[PDB]
Design a protein around this ligand. Structure first.
Ligand code: 1FL
Ligand code: 1FL
Lengths: 115, 115, 115, 115
């Protein structure tokens, strides 16, 4: 599993469950092409987005639909979404864990990159 | 000054100086139109991006070139940039301060909305 | 003003106003001695904690009463308080700004050290 | 496992390995009594600090020795340690995951509380 995302809710102190996200890869013509998508599980985790063979060098974008998450809890948040944009695998294949911590007016994202 | 950005460096404990950023507004045709831009000052702050008459309701994107900042310090970063996307909505007088805290593999952004 | 504290509320996107905090300095006998205290202003800031002559090298602790802040808003928090412990060291002129970003189950603190 | 701690390094984008931490419980005489301690593993995790029977209602303090971690990497950091203080189990037994994200001049801590 070369790409995993974990999302946490800083207001309730819980995993952020059923959070949708879309992954894009920058194409040759400088456009964002859809690549994968899914929703976080009861543990706040989204696995199985891609495979080693499919996850080639490139620039990737993870767009996390934080607004729909907060609206479902009755909170009108600041951000439309949380976007993580990064170059992947340019020194060789790596495993990426993207962690996102959500508040209505704030978010933090961090990457753990292992071999 | 209805829109201000402040950027901080978590590795050196300093304002992040000379950080470039561009502000975009979502057009009717779902495209991002350039709106404003600048570089942070010695205090890590960018002022004067827009005016009250110009800063109307809409969806805005602030793209902060964090990668160029870390490259200038010789540090290898994860993110291509830090992106803040939000709807601006005047429910009464509102000033927006976007704060971004930068580390090579992590960033946090928060909005302070005042009257 | 060699030492300033700023506190922000990630749930409401506002300065955290009327937040009490105490500053302690580590004594020779490894005990915490009260040093300064106050409450944040309408801007979320606390100034005038100490002076240049008084703020000597040593180990300092800032204890921010985050629990009372969340209780005043009717929100159930995790932490008893947010604690920032640090050594102050003049290697040349140094001013310290401690920034704290508060959520009910999370807090972030950062130091900006300027000349 | 009622209490787990995970620590991440925001400069290297990796788990923070071999990070020491001590857990204290506030005693009847308002003193902090040592309770448990350990070091994070290669995954940045510390498990097995306590048991359900031992982890009674109370106020707990987790002191993470972040300074020794950064010094071992040749970085002089701002904080002496990262302290997480909280009331545990006052509505019944819970499982607590404490997550800490470390930078030389900043840290964030978050709690995930599950039944
Ligand atoms: O770790 C924090 O407490 C923190 C602090 C800031 C911040 C810093 C300095 C300042 F003048 C204003 C701020 F919002 C911005 C983001 C952030 O996460
Ligand atoms: O407050 C923090 O220290 C923090 C923690 C995480 C995080 C999330 C999930 C996880 F399994 C480990 C983490 F460190 C993600 C972001 C973050 O700011």
């Amino acid at each position: 599993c070369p790409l995993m995302v974990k999302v946490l809710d800083a207001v309730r102190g819980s995993p952020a469950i059923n959070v949708a996200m879309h992954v894009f890869r920058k194409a040759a013509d400088d456009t964002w092409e859809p690549f994968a998508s899914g929703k976080t599980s009861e543990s706040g985790e989204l696995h199985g987005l891609t495979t080693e063979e499919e996850f080639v060098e490139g620039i990737y974008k993870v767009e996390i639909d934080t607004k729909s998450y907060w609206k479902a809890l009755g909170i009108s948040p600041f951000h439309e979404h949380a976007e993580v944009v990064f170059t992947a695998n340019d020194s060789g294949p790596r495993r990426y864990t993207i962690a996102a911590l959500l508040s209505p007016y704030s978010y933090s994202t961090t990457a753990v990159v292992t071999n």
